[PDB]
Design a protein around this ligand. Structure first.
Ligand SMILES: Nc1ncnc2c1ncn2[C@@H]1O[C@H](COP(=O)(O)OP(=O)(O)OP(=O)(O)O)[C@@H](O)[C@H]1O
Ligand SMILES: Nc1ncnc2c1ncn2[C@@H]1O[C@H](COP(=O)(O)OP(=O)(O)O)[C@@H](O)[C@H]1O
Lengths: 384, 149, 394, 50
C-alpha cells in the first residue's frame, strides 16, 4: 500500500529495474526479519488467538453509543443511549481518528469499555440531494446557444479539464456562475449538460427547499447543505429557483420576511464565509433576478453572470432538428412552416409542440406524424 | 569479521547488487551480545554502493532503515558508512540525519556522527556544517572526548 | 527489446508483495477497527489492565456540598439525584457546586472530576486554523489596518506602554461599509495575524429555534471565550443577530431582541468579558441597535469604503502579485477607469483579466486584455453592481 | 406428551426473548437492530439463520 510512488521512468531504462530490485530486496529482508519471530518465539497462532482474545476481552455485546468529547489519555465521555452520560475509556484497538461528536462509540458489555467505532452510512442531507446517475446526454443535446457552453465549460469543467492552464496563468477558476434567463429558457437543460459532463460530486437543491417552516430551520438547512457538499468532495451544487428566497410567501413557516432574510444571510455566509470552503463550485439559476438580494451577487460570491435568451430564428432550426431526432415524421410537412408560427417561441415551445404532435399521431395509432398533427399541436401549446 | 571485511574490500566500487543484498541479510540477523560483525557489513555495503549515485541513494535508504531497526553496533557503524558514502559531498538529507544522530544518548554514536559530519564537509568549507559543528561544540562543552571529536 | 520481460517481473513482485502482506494480517476490512499491529498491547495484560483495572465511572452533575462535613450532593440529569461523596483521590478544596464529574459506578462516589461540558454547538465554532490572509495581501486600508491593530494587536503586542500611560486600551471595533468593501477579507487577516484565539460567530449561527434557545448560545460562546487567557471574537453579518426593538401590536421580531440583549450583557457590565476584544462586521449597519453601537462595548467604529484613487492601485498591485502579465501595463490607468468599485471587484477584475488572457491563445496577460476585462466586469456587470443599493448604508 | 408438558414447566422458567428489527446488517454475522425503547447495538448472529 503506497510502497513507492516513483513511476517517472515510464520506459525500459535500468533505473526502473534497479528501483524494483531494491524494493524487492527490502521486502525480502523485512519478510526474513518477520519470519524468525514465529520460528523462535511464536508463542501463539497470531492469526485467530489474537482475534479470539480480542473478542473475549472487549464486551461481546457492543452497543450503539455516541461520542461527544475527546479524552486522549485512556478516557472518553459519552452519553448512554438510554441517556446516562458515561466516562468510557479508550481500548487498545481504538484507532482514535474518528473522535468527533456524533459517531457512535461501542463499549464493552462486561465493563462497558470502548469496544468499537460506529461505521456511518447515512449522510441524510447529502443523500436527499446527491445525483446518482447522469441526467442527460452530452452537451451536444443542449443545442443552439453555446454562448455559455464555452463560458460554463471554462467556469466549471475547464478547472476540472486540466487545472494547469489556469495554474500557468496564475489565477483560480471563477467564483460562481448565475444563469438567469426568460421562463423556460432551458437553464435546467444547461444543468443537464453540466451533470452529464461533470466529473466531481454534484448536489441538487430545490429553490423553496431553503425555506423551512420552523423558525431558525432555513439557516440550518443552508449550513447543512454547505457541510455536506464541502465535507463530501469537490462538488458543483446548483440551487435552482433562487428567486424563491422572498418571492413566494407561505404560512407554513412561522417567521415572516425576517426568516427569508435570515436564510439569505446564512446562504451568503456559507458562500463567502470566514474560512476556506475548499474546492467547491456553485452554479445557480433564476428566472426573476430583479428581486434577488443584491449582496448575494457582488463579485466574490457569485462571479460569472450568464444570460439565456429565447432560441434564435437560426437557433430554432437546430433546436427543432434536435428535439425531433428519432421521430418517424412523414415528409408531408416542413418544419420551417411552424418555425415562424410563434413570434416568441422559446426552447420549451419546440419540445411541447413535438410532444403534442407525437401524442396526436398516437391517438390515431398512426406510424408517422402529419402536418395537421403539428398544426393542431401548435394551437394547443401556445393558445390555452 | 575477517570474512566480511575481505568480502567488502573485494567488491568495493563494483556495485554488485547481490553482494549488497547478502550483506543486508547478514545484518538483519539478530546476534547475541559480543559479535561486532555487523559494523564491517554496513561499511562493506557503503563501499559497494559508493560506485553508483542510484547505489548511493539506495544505500542511504537502507542505512536509514537499519538505523531504525539496527542494534547498537549497527547504530554506531551507520554514521561512519553514510559519511563514507558522501565524502566531500554535503547532501542536505545526510547532513540532517547526522545532525539528528549527533544528539543520541549513546556517546559513541555521537562521536561517529560528528566524525562523519567532518568527513562530509572536508574541503568544502560549508557554512551550515561549520554552524552545526559550533552548536555541537557548545552542547558538548563538558565532555572532553566529544569536544575533541 | 524485452518488453514482456520487465512487465512480467514487475507484476510478479507486485503480486508477491500482497501475497506476503496477507500472511501477517491487514485484511478483513472491519467497520471501525484498528490494525492488529495497533492494539497488540492489550492482549492478555494491557486489556486486563485497560479493562480490568478501570471502571466506567459515569459522569453527572453536582449541586452543592453541605457544611459541617464533606456532605456532597450527587445529582444525575437523567438518572436520579442522591446524597453521595467524592473519592479518596480528590481534594476537598475542589468541591465545586455544580461541577460535571463521574462517581464510582458501584460506590456511587465521585472518583474523578471533569472539565465543564463543551456544548458542541459552540465548541465547533473555533478557528483552530488561521486563514491564508496576511497583511501584505489586504492592502488598500492602511489606516483601518492601523486602527484594528491598535485594538487587537498593538495593545497585546507590548502591554507595557498602556500600563505606563495609564489608560484602558480601546475595547472593540465595528467595521461597517458597503458590501464587498473588504470586511471579511480583513477579518481573515486579523485571524491569520495575531495569536490569540478568534471565535467566528456567523450572524445566522445564533438564531435558535426554541424560545431563548439562541441566547444560551451567546452565554456559551462568552464562557468558552472567558475560559481562555485572551480572546478576540469576530462576528460577521451582525445585521442578523439583532437590529433594534420595534415591537408593535402582535409581538414580532422580538426574539432576536433577546439574543442581542444577551450578547450585549456578556459584552458590557457586571464583570464584563475583560480579556476579550470584539471585532464585528456589518454590511448594512443602518439597523444596528443604539445600545450595541454605544461606546464602551464597540467603541471603535472604523469604516471601510471604496478606495478612491490610490486604493485601487494598491489593490491591483496586491491581487495581481502572481499573474503573468506584460510588464508594459499601466495599472493606474485601470484604477482611474473604475470610478467606484469594491475591492472584491478588483480581485474579480484581476481574475477576469487572467481568464480573458488564457481564453484564446496568449500565455501572458495583456494591457488590452485587462482593459477588455474592465469593460465587462465594471462596465458590463454594472447593471446591479451591488454598490448603489447599499452605498447609503440602507 | 406428559414429558413435554413437564418440559414446558422449565421452558417457562427460562428468561424470555426480546424482539428485534435489524436496521443494518454487517458481514460475518454482525447485527445492529432497533431495541424497543433503547436503540441499537453491535452483536452477532445465531447458528441456523440465513
Ligand atoms: N483591501 C483588500 N485587499 C485585498 N483583497 C481585498 C480587499 N478588499 C476586498 N478584497 C477581496 O474581497 C474578498 C473578500 O472580502 P469580502 O468581499 O468578503 O468582504 P465583505 O465586505 O465582508 O463582503 P460581504 O459584506 O458582502 O460579506 C476577497 O476576494 C479579497 O481578496
Ligand atoms: N434547445 C433547447 N433550448 C432551451 N430549452 C430547451 C431546449 N430543448 C428543450 N428545452 C426545454 O427547456 C426546459 C429546461 O428547463 P428550464 O427552461 O430551465 O425551466 P425553468 O426556466 O422554468 O426553470 C425543458 O422544458 C426542456 O424541454
Amino acid at each position: 500500500a503506497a510502497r513507492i510512488p516513483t513511476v517517472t521512468p515510464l520506459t525500459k531504462c535500468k533505473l526502473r529495474l534497479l528501483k524494483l530490485e531494491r524494493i524487492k530486496d527490502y521486502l525480502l529482508m523485512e519478510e526474513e526479519f518477520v519470519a524468525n519471530q514465529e520460528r523462535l518465539k511464536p508463542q501463539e497462532e497470531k492469526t485467530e488467538e489474537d482475534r479470539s482474545k480480542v473478542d473475549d476481552i472487549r464486551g461481546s455485546p457492543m452497543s450503539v453509543g455516541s461520542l461527544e468529547e475527546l479524552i486522549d489519555e485512556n478516557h472518553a465521555i459519552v452519553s448512554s443511549s438510554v441517556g446516562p452520560e458515561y466516562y468510557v475509556s479508550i481500548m487498545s484497538f481504538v484507532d482514535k481518528d474518528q473522535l468527533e461528536p456524533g459517531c457512535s462509540i461501542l463499549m464493552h458489555n462486561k465493563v462497558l469499555s470502548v469496544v468499537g467505532l460506529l461505521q456511518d452510512e447515512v449522510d441524510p442531507m447529502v443523500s436527499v440531494m446527491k445525483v446518482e446517475k447522469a441526467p442527460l446526454e452530452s452537451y451536444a443535446d443542449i443545442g443552439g446557444l453555446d454562448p455559455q457552453i464555452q463560458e460554463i465549460k471554462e467556469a466549471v469543467e475547464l478547472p476540472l479539464t486540466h487545472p494547469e492552464l489556469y495554474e500557468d496563468i496564475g489565477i483560480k477558476p471563477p467564483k460562481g456562475v448565475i444563469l438567469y434567463g426568460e421562463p423556460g429558457t432551458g437553464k435546467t437543460l444547461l444543468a443537464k449538460a453540466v451533470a452529464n459532463s461533470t466529473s466531481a460530486t454534484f448536489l441538487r437543491v430545490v429553490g423553496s427547499e431553503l425555506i423551512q417552516k420552523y423558525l431558525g430551520d432555513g439557516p440550518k438547512l443552508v449550513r447543512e447543505l454547505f457541510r455536506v457538499a464541502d465535507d463530501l468532495s469537490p462538488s458543483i451544487v446548483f440551487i435552482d429557483e433562487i428567486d424563491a428566497v422572498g418571492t413566494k410567501r407561505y404560512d407554513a413557516h412561522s417567521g415572516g420576511e425576517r426568516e427569508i432574510q435570515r436564510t439569505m444571510l446564512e446562504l451568503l455566509n456559507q458562500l463567502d464565509g470566514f474560512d476556506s470552503r475548499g474546492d467547491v463550485k456553485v452554479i445557480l439559476a433564476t428566472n426573476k433576478i430583479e428581486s434577488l438580494d443584491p449582496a448575494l451577487l457582488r463579485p466574490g460570491r457569485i462571479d460569472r453572470k450568464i444570460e439565456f435568451p429565447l432560441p434564435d430564428i437560426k437557433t430554432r432550426r437546430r433546436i427543432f432538428t434536435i428535439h425531433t431526432s428519432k421521430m418517424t415524421l412523414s415528409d408531408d410537412v416542413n418544419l420551417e412552416e411552424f418555425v415562424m408560427t410563434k413570434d416568441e417561441f422559446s426552447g420549451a415551445d419546440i419540445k411541447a409542440i413535438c410532444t403534442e404532435a407525437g401524442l396526436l399521431a398516437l391517438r390515431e395509432r398512426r406510424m408517422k406524424v402529419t402536418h395537421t398533427d403539428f398544426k393542431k399541436a401548435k394551437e394547443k401549446v401556445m393558445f390555452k | 569479521h575477517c570474512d566480511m571485511t575481505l568480502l567488502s574490500c573485494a567488491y568495493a566500487g563494483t556495485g554488485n547488487v547481490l553482494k549488497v543484498q547478502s550483506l543486508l541479510g547478514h545484518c538483519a540477523q539478530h546476534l547475541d551480545k559480543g559479535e561486532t560483525h555487523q559494523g564491517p557489513a554496513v561499511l562493506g555495503i557503503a563501499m559497494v554502493a559508493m560506485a553508483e549515485e542510484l547505489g548511493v541513494e539506495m544505500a542511504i535508504r537502507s542505512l536509514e532503515h537499519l538505523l531504525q531497526y539496527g542494534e547498537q553496533n549497527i547504530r554506531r557503524a551507520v554514521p561512519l558508512a553514510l559519511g563514507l558514502l558522501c565524502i566531500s559531498n554535503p547532501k542536505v538529507n545526510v547532513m540532517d540525519t547526522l545532525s539528528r544522530l549527533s544528539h543520541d544518548s549513546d556517546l559513541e554514536v555521537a562521536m561517529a556522527a560528528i566524525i562523519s559530519l567532518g568527513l562530509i564537509g572536508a574541503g568544502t568549507n560549508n557554512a551550515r556544517i561549520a554552524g552545526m559543528l559550533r552548536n555541537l561544540s557548545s552542547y558538548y562543552y563538558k565532555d572532553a572526548s566529544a569536544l575533541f571529536c | 527489446p524485452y518488453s514482456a520481460s520487465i512487465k512480467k517481473v514487475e507484476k510478479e513482485i507486485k503480486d508477491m508483495s500482497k501475497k506476503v502482506n496477507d500472511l501477517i494480517g491487514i485484511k478483513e476490512s472491519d467497520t471501525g477497527l484498528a490494525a492488529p499491529s495497533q492494539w497488540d498491547l492489550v492482549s492478555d495484560k494491557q486489556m486486563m489492565q485497560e479493562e480490568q483495572p478501570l471502571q466506567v465511572a459515569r459522569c453527572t452533575k453536582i449541586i452543592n456540598p453541605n457544611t459541617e462535613d464533606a456532605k456532597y450532593v450527587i445529582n444525575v440529569k437523567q438518572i436520579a439525584k442522591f446524597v453521595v461523596g467524592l473519592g479518596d483521590k480528590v481534594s476537598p478544596t475542589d468541591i465545586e457546586e455544580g461541577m460535571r464529574v463521574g462517581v464510582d459506578r458501584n460506590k456511587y462516589q465521585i472518583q474523578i472530576p471533569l472539565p465543564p461540558k463543551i456544548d458542541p454547538s459552540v465548541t465547533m465554532m473555533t478557528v483552530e486554523e488561521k486563514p491564508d490572509v496576511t497583511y501584505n495581501d489586504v492592502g488598500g486600508c492602511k489606516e483601518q489596518i492601523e486602527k484594528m491593530r491598535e485594538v487587537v494587536e498593538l495593545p497585546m503586542l507590548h502591554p507595557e506602554k498602556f500600563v505606563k500611560l495609564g489608560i484602558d486600551p480601546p475595547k472593540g471595533v465595528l467595521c461597517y461599509g458597503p458590501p464587498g468593501t473588504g470586511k471579511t477579507l480583513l477579518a481573515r487577516a486579523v485571524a491569520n495575524r495575531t495569536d490569540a484565539c478568534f471565535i467566528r460567530v456567523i450572524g445566522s449561527e445564533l438564531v435558535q429555534k426554541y424560545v431563548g434557545e439562541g441566547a444560551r448560545m451567546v452565554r456559551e460562546l462568552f464562557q468558552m471565550a472567558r475560559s481562555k487567557k485572551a480572546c478576540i471574537v469576530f462576528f460577521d453579518e451582525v445585521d442578523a443577530i439583532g437590529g433594534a426593538r420595534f415591537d408593535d401590536g402582535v409581538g414580532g421580531d422580538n426574539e432576536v431582541q433577546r439574543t442581542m440583549l444577551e450578547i450585549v450583557n456578556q459584552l458590557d457590565g457586571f464583570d464584563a468579558r475583560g480579556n476579550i476584544k470584539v471585532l464585528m462586521a456589518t454590511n448594512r449597519p443602518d439597523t444596528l441597535d443604539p445600545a450595541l453601537l454605544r461606546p464602551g462595548r464597540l467603541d471603535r467604529k472604523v469604516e471601510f469604503g471604496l478606495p478612491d484613487l490610490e486604493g485601487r492601485t494598491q489593490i491591483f498591485k496586491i491581487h495581481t502579485r502572481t499573474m503573468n502579465c506584460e510588464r508594459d501595463i499601466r495599472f493606474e490607468l485601470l484604477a482611474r477607469l473604475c470610478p467606484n468599485s469594491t475591492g472584491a471587484d478588483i480581485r474579480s477584475v484581476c481574475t477576469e483579466a487572467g481568464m480573458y488572457a488564457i481564453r484564446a491563445r496568449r500565455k501572458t496577460v495583456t494591457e488590452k486584455d485587462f482593459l477588455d476585462a474592465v469593460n465587462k466586469v465594471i462596465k458590463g456587470y454594472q447593471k446591479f453592481s451591488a454598490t448603489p443599493k447599499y452605498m447609503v448604508y440602507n | 406428551h406428559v414429558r413435554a408438558l413437564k418440559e414446558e414447566l422449565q421452558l417457562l422458567q427460562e428468561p424470555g426473548s426480546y424482539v428485534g428489527e435489524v436496521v443494518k446488517v454487517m458481514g460475518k454475522s454482525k447485527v445492529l437492530v432497533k431495541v424497543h425503547p433503547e436503540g441499537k447495538y453491535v452483536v452477532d448472529i445465531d447458528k441456523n439463520i440465513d
